[PDB]
């Protein structure tokens, strides 16, 4: 627990957001390529 | 088809056919208790169960080398699920037959 | 379609609004109102706030 906040993000929630957001970015990068 | 044999004396309760025989039906009528169970989650990361969806649209982006044809794309979904029963003394059930 | 954020408080839901004139007092005088509902629940009902 790095902070004094009552509720903290934790690393796992952030990785969940990354995993959720990645599919759109992958489909987008095809056009740039 | 988990009841008894259903002859012609049926007063009008639902039945079903199990390999050439007529058998009754059993119905749950369930009661969930408080804090009886919790659902195990693998990287669900919140409350909702987490799905995983993929899609590869038809195109040259998967032209490969064995077969440039086969434009058939796909979409796939998968998930992990499990349950833990902390106290099984708080789940109640009343089996019964049901009318037509 | 399949995108869902982790935290429930930050989830995105679709809501409807109704800007119009209604006879609030039943005497035949039309007055502006605004109404907002989500799903099947009416969450807001008040007069037009703007001048």
UniProtKB/Swiss-Prot annotation, chain A:
Stated role: Forms the portal vertex of the capsid. This portal plays critical roles in head assembly, genome packaging, neck/tail attachment, and genome ejection. The portal protein multimerizes as a single ring-shaped homododecamer arranged around a central channel.
Lineage, highest ranks first: Viruses, Duplodnaviria, Heunggongvirae, Uroviricota, Caudoviricetes
Gene: 59
Origin species: Enterobacteria phage N4
Transmembrane segments: none
Residues included from the entire protein: 19 to 51 of 763
Cysteines paired by S-S bonds: none
Residues spanning the signal sequence: none
The protein's name: Probable portal protein
Compartment list: Virion
Subunit organization: Homododecamer.
UniProtKB/Swiss-Prot annotation, chain B:
Domain of life per record: Viruses
Keyword annotations of the record: Capsid protein, Virion
Record localization: Virion
GO cellular component terms, A-Z: viral capsid
Function recorded in the entry: Assembles, to form an icosahedral capsid with a T=9 symmetry, about 60 nm in diameter, and consisting of 535 capsid proteins.
Protein's name according to its UniProt entry: Major capsid protein
Organism the protein comes from: Enterobacteria phage N4 (Bacteriophage N4)
Full-sequence range covered: 302 to 401 of 401
From Swiss-Prot, chain C:
Chain segments annotated as coiled-coil in the UniProt record: none
Localisation per UniProt entry: Virion
Protein origin, superkingdom: Viruses
Function, in words: Forms the portal vertex of the capsid. This portal plays critical roles in head assembly, genome packaging, neck/tail attachment, and genome ejection. The portal protein multimerizes as a single ring-shaped homododecamer arranged around a central channel.
Assembly with partners or alone: Homododecamer.
Stated name of the protein: Probable portal protein
Source organism of this protein record: Enterobacteria phage N4
Organismal lineage: Viruses, Duplodnaviria, Heunggongvirae, Uroviricota, Caudoviricetes
Gene that encodes the chain: 59
Parent-protein start and end of this portion: 307 to 357 of 763
């Amino acid at each position: 627990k790095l902070t004094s906040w009552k509720n903290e993000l934790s690393l796992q929630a952030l990785k969940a957001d990354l995993d959720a957001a990645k599919p759109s970015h992958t489909a987008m990068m095809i056009k740039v390529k | 088809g988990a009841g008894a044999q259903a002859t012609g004396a049926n007063p009008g309760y639902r039945t079903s056919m199990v390999s050439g025989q007529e058998h009754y039906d059993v119905y749950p009528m369930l009661v969930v208790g408080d804090d009886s169970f919790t659902s195990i989650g693998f990287q669900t990361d919140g409350k909702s169960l987490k799905f995983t969806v993929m899609t590869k649209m038809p195109g040259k982006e998967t032209a490969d080398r064995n077969d440039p044809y086969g434009e058939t794309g796909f979409s796939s979904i998968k998930w992990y699920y499990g349950i833990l029963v902390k106290r099984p003394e708080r789940l109640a059930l009343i089996k019964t037959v049901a009318p037509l | 379609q399949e995108f869902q954020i982790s935290d429930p408080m930050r989830k995105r839901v679709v809501a409807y609004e109704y800007w119009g004139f209604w006879d609030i007092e039943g005497n035949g005088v039309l007055e502006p109102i605004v109404a907002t509902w989500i799903g099947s629940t009416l969450i807001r009902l008040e007069k037009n706030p703007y001048p």
